[PDB]
């Protein structure tokens, strides 16, 4: 699963079948690392109008 975003520690727990978490727009809000069973929040990189 490919995305560009900042990775941070995630408070929310994931059930074992629920490897990935999806938001309303179908973007992947949180992921669980394969090797280490920890949940990582994905926050999109900062963007704004100029």
């Amino acid at each position: 699963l490919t995305g560009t975003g900042v990775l941070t520690e995630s408070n929310k727990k994931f059930l074992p079948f629920q490897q990935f978490g999806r938001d309303i727009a179908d973007t992947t809000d949180a992921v669980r690392d394969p090797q280490t069973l920890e949940i990582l929040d994905i926050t999109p990189c900062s963007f704004g109008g100029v």
Binding site: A25, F47, G48
Partner: protein
Amino acid sequence: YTMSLGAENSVAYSNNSIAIPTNFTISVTTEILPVSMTKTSVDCTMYICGDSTECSNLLLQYGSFCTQLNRALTGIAVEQDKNTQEVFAQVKQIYKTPPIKDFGGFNFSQILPDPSKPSKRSPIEDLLFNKVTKFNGLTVLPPLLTDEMIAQYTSALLAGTITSGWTFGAGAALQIPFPMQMAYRFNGIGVTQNVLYENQKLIANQFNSAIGKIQDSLSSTPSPLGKLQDVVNQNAQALNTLVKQLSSNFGAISSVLNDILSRLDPPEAEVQIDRLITGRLQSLQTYVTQQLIRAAEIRASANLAATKMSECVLGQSKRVDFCGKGYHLMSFPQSAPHGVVFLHVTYVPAQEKNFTTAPAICHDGKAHFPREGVFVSNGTHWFVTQRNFYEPQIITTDNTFVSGNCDVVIGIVNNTVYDP
């Protein structure tokens, strides 16, 4: 049930009978008007093609759709600030109320700005503000004028109205005592100034109680601010629908562009990307068109609000129901989130007594008609009183002009006209 249209009343109509009010009620009513909406900027490229060069290159083939969509949203955003300036920035000078709040018993503390609170916002405005309640290229632009700045405009308009009445709107602000200004409002709606001076304490108490009822009602319930919350809900729902549309596949293998790129070669991916682009572009076009229609409705509301500021706050209006129900006296503006709340002060006739009325009075073979007012009979005597308030006076040559003769008028009554 069949809906009732209201209580049935039969007026006691009669050629000889008039009803004259012997009392009045000072009424303050609230009119809530939407002024502006949240300024939303959507970047089409980010929404349709987030961080994908291939999708962006395909989007270029469509051409100018992004430029016109961004231009339309930017025009709406500029329009919202223009709407706010038109409603609240009418007066260049920032008027301030005198430090001693002596206005002949009239108390404006609830509408006037409260110093103790950190915001220089009125108590009623603080209630109003309490009562109103992403990463896809969607941004919210802050309004040019802050809420504090809007409160300063409403404060300046309120200070101008109390100190100068209607003069500051027309030109240079001319100080007038509020009692004299209130009498001018009475002489506008046809009631004599003397009646106001006789009942000035009663008018002050009724006005203060009416403001108290407005603030108590605002504290009790939040239904009044529902139109201002309706605008917010409509914009929020439209934005939510736009974000939800991203999850739609639109006939593609997946709604996620990254998945399509990852699992498919670029020409094969391009086939599916085109379906996704068509769906997202249609969703954006629908949202922008709805925003433009909503913007036109909000602009019409703002134009009406600016007109009401000019014709109710800045001046006394003779237009029926434009500035509250009843005979308009004055209006006070209160800032509200993305809107203006108008407190309309009106004179309402309260207690009515039936009398006997004659169009003219025949005295010396010549018909007499009132210069102002109407002829009323208590059943034993004939008097002339002003139409709005019952103030019977001895019929006199000064009171009544003379026209023609007794024969022509229908319903003329023989009575004596005193000569001073």
